[PDB]
Symmetry: none
Subunit: 49 residues, 4 copies
């Protein structure tokens, strides 16, 4: 079957990769931000004793 | 002009780089989620001291 | 850097160009063989 | 399902084929035209002499 079909499949895969990378980075920056907030609040609470 | 194999190779390297970057970001995210879970569990312990 | 879609389109373009070029060369070769056959048959009927 | 490298390799193979086929076809077309024109010139010069 014609090369264009397979070619388009590769293009669609690149679209998925680009969006998936965006989503994973977004989630990584967020989970780290939130985690650091709790680490700091915890040290502060500890030193209030 | 530029031989077609230059373009073909660049595309190949894009596909590979994105697949690898996606695996990388996913393992980094597994680790971040574990770290966050550990920190929150310690915070709970501290707030019930 | 260059967005992946630039390279991807360049390749799709090359694939298309080559497919088109092969169709063109083939149709031209059909005509050229017909003319050659005609010419040689004519030449045989002059060398008589 | 099937890893993209498989399909990507098939495409590279198709381009290899395309390049070689184009070379071959151009070789053949150039030659056919060359020989044909040889015979046309020959036939011209001969027929004016009859």
């Amino acid at each position: 079957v014609h090369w264009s079909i397979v070619y388009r499949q590769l293009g669609n895969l690149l679209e998925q990769y680009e969006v998936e990378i965006a989503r994973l980075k977004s989630q990584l920056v967020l989970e780290k931000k939130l985690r650091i907030q709790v680490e700091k609040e915890m040290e502060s609470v500890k030193t209030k004793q």
